[PDB]
Design brief:
With about 450 residues, the protein is an alpha+beta fold. It is about 40% helix and about 20% strand. It is classed as ligase.
Length: about 450
Amino acid sequence: SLSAHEIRELFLSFFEKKGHTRVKSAPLVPENDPTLLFVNAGMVPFKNVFLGLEKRPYKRATSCQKCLRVSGKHNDLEQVGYTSRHHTFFEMLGNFSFGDYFKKEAIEYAWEFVTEVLKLPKEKLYVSVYKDDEEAYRIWNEHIGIPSERIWRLGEEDNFWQMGDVGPCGPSSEIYVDRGEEYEGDERYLEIWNLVFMQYNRDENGVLTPLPHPNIDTGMGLERIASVLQGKNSNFEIDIIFPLIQFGEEVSGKKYGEKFETDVALRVIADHLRAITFAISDGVIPSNEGRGYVIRRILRRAMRFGYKLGIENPFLYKGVDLVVDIMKEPYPELELSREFVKGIVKGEEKRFIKTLKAGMEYIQEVIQKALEEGRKTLSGKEVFTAYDTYGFPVDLIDEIAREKGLGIDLEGFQCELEEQRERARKHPVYSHLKELGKTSAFVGAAAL
C-alpha cells in the first residue's frame, strides 16, 4: 500500500540513483516572479534553466514541489470540494532533464518506478502519446513492451504541453492505470503520470523549430498516486488528508459519507487547512490585495462552509497546529512557523467570524425574497452590499447563491462599482473602469 510519505521519499531517492539531483522544494511564492503568485508545477522554478538562461551544476533534477492551483488556467478552486480529485494545495513529483536525456530515458525511467519499484501491475496500464508519434509510439510499444492495444493517439487537447502561447513545447505522453470494471472513465483509468518532452520552439506564432537540446518535464500529483496504492476512491481518504476530514466531524457534529453537500463542506475544510498553513508558512500575509486576498478567500470559504456545518466559533486555527504532524517529515520547517501560522489563521477567524454570519442571513433573505418573485439573479446592488458591508468575495457570494439556484448578475454589479467609485470622485489595488467586476473578484472593496 505504502504511505504518502514513503511514496515521496522513494520517488526522490529513485532518480538520484540515476543521476538526477534532489532540488529542495522552492517556496510556493517565487522570490522574483511577479509573473505568477503561487507555483503550480514542479517545472515553474526551473523555467529559466529549461530555456537555458540559468546555469546549473547538474543536467538532471528530481523533486516534489508545493503547488497552488487557485488561479486561471490552472485554477481548480471553483470545484474544490465538489469532487474527489481537485485541490488548491498539492504536491507534484517528477524529474527533469535539460538538453540531456530525452524520450527514451524518460520513458524507461518512468516505466521502472511503476512496475518494479512501487509494485503496481503492468497489465492494467494504458499509455497515451502524440498521434503521429511514430517516435514515441515505437518506444512504448517495442523497447518498453507496452501492448499496442493499450496505446491511444490523442490531440493537443490531450498531449501538447506548451510553456506559453509562445515557447518550449513538445509531445507529451501520459501513463494511465486501470482501476476495476465497476467504475469507468477518468476514474477507472487514472493518469498518475505526465511526461512532457520539450521538443520545439513555438515562436510568436505556431512555427515550431526543433531544439538541439530538447528538455524533459514530468509531473505526478502525489495525492493522486498515493490513493490508488492505498485502494481508496477518494484522494482525501488517505493518511495524509483523512485525519483532516476527521477534524471537521469532531468540531462540527456531522459525519463523512451521508449527505452530498455535507461531504462537500468537509472536504473544503480539509483542503483549505493545508492551503492556508503552507501559504502563511512561506511568508504570505492575508490582505485586501492579490496574494493576501487569495489565502483570505481560501480561508473565508473555510469559515463559511464550516459555519454551514454548525461550527459557531472559530475552528480552523485548531487545524494549522495539525497539518504540521501530517507534513513535518518532508517539510520540517513547518514546526518553526507553526505558532506563527496559528495566530495568523486565528486572526482571520476571531477578526472575521461574526461578519460572515451577519453576511449569511443577508444572502439567504435576499435570495428567498428574490426566488419568491421569480427573479433569476440578484441585482448587482444585492451583491455589492455583501462585497462591501460584509467584505464578501465576489466568488463566495456566487457560490452560496448557486446552492439555491440563483446566480448573480455581473453587469449590474459593474454599474454599481462605477456609481460607487464615481460617487467618491463626486458625491495598493488599482482597477480599470470596465475591469471593475473583473478585478473586484480578485480583491476586496477596500482595495478598489
